[PDB]
Ligand binder design. Structure first.
Ligand SMILES: Nc1nc2ccc(C(=O)NCC(=O)O)cc2s1
Length: 247
């Protein structure tokens, strides 16, 4: 998250922090995600495609910090890593960049809600705010593009929804951007998602409810003029999500 501000998990209690175990046993951060129900975290497929095996992943809920534990956090394994069959990666653009992780504890349970761990509503089908709407994005991604380190403290910022039509332009993304994607950006290109924020939430207030409108997916650089952040448009994948979150 370029710009924006520091936050804690109370202000985004559905945010999930996804890590992977390396052979040799170091644990490194992967991406964010969003808890949509007690046993289901939603994220991007690109976070996972190179290491598609569900036993290497660890998911924390209720965690505000990168490399230190937060009081009341819950730690999970991935009983289940579900990647979108139609995924596709071009140079930048990732298509169908959506993934479901079914979480379970060593004790075999899902999330128990708390002050620091709640779920986020999906939008209803093909229902998104109008362009120019202000939404929030959350993550542990880089604070500046040149950084080597990721912030130890969770961050969020505000970006505004850009029309399919604006984002369509040459000087923007041309045809890299589909109607299954959403663009969002700051009017001064001042603040943005960046490397490491992938998989986490773009949350818009939609009919006065906090709604998971987008999932951080890609962009050319960060906080670059004419180069918005690109988000998977959740309201075009509800059947995929509905089918894949069952028995
Ligand atoms: N809005 C975004 N800008 C960028 C720039 C770079 C990257 C990127 O390379 N990320 C690696 C990663 O996914 O963490 C992701 C984004 S998402």
């Amino acid at each position: 998250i370029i710009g924006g501000e520091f936050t804690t998990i109370e202000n985004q209690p559905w945010f999930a922090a996804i890590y992977r175990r390396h052979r040799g046993g170091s644990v490194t951060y992967v991406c964010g995600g969003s808890l949509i129900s007690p046993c289901w975290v939603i994220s991007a497929t690109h976070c996972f495609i190179d290491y598609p095996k569900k036993e290497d992943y660890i998911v924390y809920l209720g965690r505000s910090r990168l490399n230190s534990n937060t009081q009341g956090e819950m730690k999970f394994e991935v009983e289940n890593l579900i990647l979108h069959k139609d995924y596709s990666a071009d140079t930048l653009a990732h298509h169908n960049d959506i993934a479901l992780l079914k979480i379970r504890s060593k004790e075999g349970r899902c999330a128990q809600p708390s002050r620091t761990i709640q779920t986020i509503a999906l939008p209803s089908m093909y229902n998104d705010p109008q362009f120019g709407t202000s939404c929030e994005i959350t993550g542990f991604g880089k604070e500046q593009s040149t950084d080597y380190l990721y912030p130890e403290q969770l961050k969020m910022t505000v970006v505004k929804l850009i029309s399919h039509r604006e984002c369509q332009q040459p000087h923007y993304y041309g045809s890299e951007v589909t109607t299954k994607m959403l663009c969002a950006a700051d009017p001064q290109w001042k603040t943005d998602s960046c490397q490491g924020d992938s998989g986490g939430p773009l949350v818009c207030s939609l009919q006065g409810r906090m709604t998971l409108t987008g999932i951080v997916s890609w962009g050319r650089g960060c906080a670059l003029k004419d180069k918005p952040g690109v988000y998977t448009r959740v309201s075009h994948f509800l059947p995929w999500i509905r089918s894949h979150t069952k028995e």
